[PDB]
Amino acid sequence: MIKQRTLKNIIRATGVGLHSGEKVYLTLKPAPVDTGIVFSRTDLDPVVEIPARAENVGETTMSTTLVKGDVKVDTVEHLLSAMAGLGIDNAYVELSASEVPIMDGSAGPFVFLIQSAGLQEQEAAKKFIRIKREVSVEEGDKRAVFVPFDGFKVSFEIDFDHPVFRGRTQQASVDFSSTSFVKEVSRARTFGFMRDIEYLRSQNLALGGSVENAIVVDENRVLNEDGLRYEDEFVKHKILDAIGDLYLLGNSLIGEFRGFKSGHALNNQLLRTLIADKDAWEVVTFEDARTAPISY
Ligand SMILES: C[C@@](O)(C(F)F)[C@H](NC(=O)c1ccc(C#CC#Cc2ccc(N)cc2)cc1)C(=O)NO
Ligand SMILES: [Zn+2]
Ligand SMILES: [Zn+2]
């Protein structure tokens, strides 16, 4: 059978919150079968735990935030993307502050941590959510869709008209049958338009932002001296974001995601909309891995 997966060891890192700018301690720990991913604010007294589930998502305007009453864990999507890409079912995530460190702006550092911790197979069947019927959500010209697919595929299109984006592909369709999440998606950095970053900083926001953890573009060019890590790094980060946001389902997907100019808000709306309709999905396991449309 395809088994559930956790970490072999506890592993740690430090960084700053993109939004808050404050130093934060991060800890990844093994967890028992059927735990899922659980975030803990270990700085609080008592310590507050928030399961990484779609229903616990609060505001999504900037990043995906988990909320439990007045306690928040901000910017979970890049770390969760790495968890999803490496097929980590169960883990504890401890934080000394209200935001996951931005690190280098991608999922790369978290892939590195998870891999360094080691992967532990557990004696329980891994559950998958299989999309049975196409489900979609919209806001204006923005659209997020689940489509039936015998495997796991993420497709995305962005549609920026700014000169800096002219001629760029602005579209990618990743079938993970033949694409490595680690090598081809995970190191895609977050990006920001100079005007938008300036507006945030003017309000004492995005205090942790720098060229060392974000691609900065103005109307016409990429400001980072070393350019891009991937030729299509922009859309690949949108795909990265989607994979992380989607993992708040609590299980790996058998199906396709299609995003069109969408972000965290529509991603979460899509999840809640899917979950509510039980004719649109089912939970499956694989007693024989060779019969599975996916592989970890
Ligand atoms: C990409 C995104 O919008 C998505 F939701 F689509 C979203 N990204 C952000 O919202 C975002 C917010 C702020 C920054 C920034 C910065 C800076 C700087 C700076 C400081 C000093 C100097 N000299 C130069 C640069 C970058 C990204 C995202 O990835 N969420 O997961
Ligand atoms: Zn423009
Ligand atoms: Zn992102």
Cα–Cα distance for residue pair 122/37, rounded to 1 Å: 15
Active-site pick, 264, 269, 271, 286: 264
Pairwise CA distance, residues 35 & 37, whole Å: 6
Helices (H), the chain: 77-85, 108-117, 181-184, 194-202, 233-246, 264-276
Going by the DSSP 8-state scheme, the letter that residue 126 receives in this structure is P
107 lines ligand 1 (CB under 6 A): no
* CB of 294 closer than 6 angstroms to any ligand 1 atom: no
Query: Which burial class, exposed, middle or buried, applies to 79 when counting CB atoms under 10 A from its CB (0-12, 13-18, 19+)?
Result: buried
Pocket flag, ligand 1, residue 156 (CB < 6 Å): no
Half-sphere exposure of 282 (CA within 13 A, CB side): 6
Atom of ligand 1 nearest to the CA of 105: 29
Q: Is 74 annotated as a binding residue?
A: no
Torsion of CA 172, 278, 275, 33, to 10 degrees: -100
Residues 136-147 as b/e (b if ≥16 CB within 10 A, e otherwise) read ebeeeeebbbbe
Q: Determine the Cα–Cα distance for residues 120 and 90; give it in Å rounded to an integer.
A: 10
- Ligand 1, atom 29, residue with closest C-alpha: 190
Question: Is the torsion defined by CA of 21, 263, 65, 32 positive or negative?
Answer: negative
CA 35 to chain centre: 18
- Experimental technique of record: X-ray
Pairing of strands 171-175, 152-157: antiparallel
Spatial distance between the Cα atoms of 15 and 89, rounded to a whole number of angstroms: 24
CA–CA separation, 78 and 63 (whole Å): 10
Q: Which tokens belong to 180?
A: 């490595």
For residues 141 and 284, what is the distance between their CA atoms, to the nearest angstrom?
33
What is the distance between the alpha carbons of residues 134 and 256, in angstroms, rounded to a whole number? 9
Helix axes 108-117, 77-85, angle to 10 degrees: 50
Cβ partners under 8 Å of residue 138, min gap 6: 144, 266
**Which is nearest to 87 in space by CA: 212, 253, 207?**
253
Q: Is 104 in the pocket of ligand 1 (CB under 6 A)?
A: no
Distances (CA, A) of 78 to 87, 112, 138, 186: 14, 13, 23, 9
Query: Probe ligand 1: pick from 75, 99, 190, 248, max atoms within 8 Å of CB?
Result: 190
Let me know: does 134 contact 146? Beta carbons within 8 Å: yes
Enter the tokens of residue 246. 């989607």
The verdict on whether 264 is a catalytic residue reads yes
Instruction: Classify residue 190 by its DSSP letter.
Output: P
d(CA 223, CA 124): 48
Give, rounded to a whole angstrom, the gap between the first and last alpha carbons of the chain. 12
Resolution (A): 1.6
d(CA 172, CA 175): 10
Q: Which residues pair with 74 in a beta bridge?
A: 99
Q: Which of 158, 197, 207 to mutate to test the pocket of ligand 1 (most atoms within 8 A of CB)?
A: 197
Residue 137 near residue 266 (C-beta atoms within 8 A): yes
Q: Which two three-digit tokens encode residue 120?
A: 């532990």
For residue 75, count other CB atoms closer than 10 A to its CB. 25
Domains of the chain, first to last: 1-127 (3.30.230.20), 128-296 (3.30.1700.10)
Ligand nearest to the CA of 76: 1
Q: What DSSP letter does each residue of the chain carry, written as one string? A: -PEEEEESS-EEEEEEBTTT--EEEEEEEE--TT--EEEEETTSSS-EEEE--GGGB---SSS--EEETTEEEB--HHHHHHHHHTT--BEEEEESSSB-B-TTSSSHHHHHHHHHH-EEEEEEEPPEEEE-S-EEEEETTEEEEEE--SSEEEEEE----SGGGTT---EEEEETTT--HHHHTTTPPPEEEHHHHHHHHHTT-STT--TTTSEEE-SS-B-STT--SSTTHHHHHHHHHHHHHHGGGSSEEEEEEEEES--HHHHHHHHHHHHH-TTSEEEE--SSGGG-S---
Establish whether 162 is an annotated binding residue: no
In angstroms, what is the C-alpha Rg of the chain? 18
The alpha carbon of 190 and the centre of ligand 1 are apart by a number of angstroms equal to 6
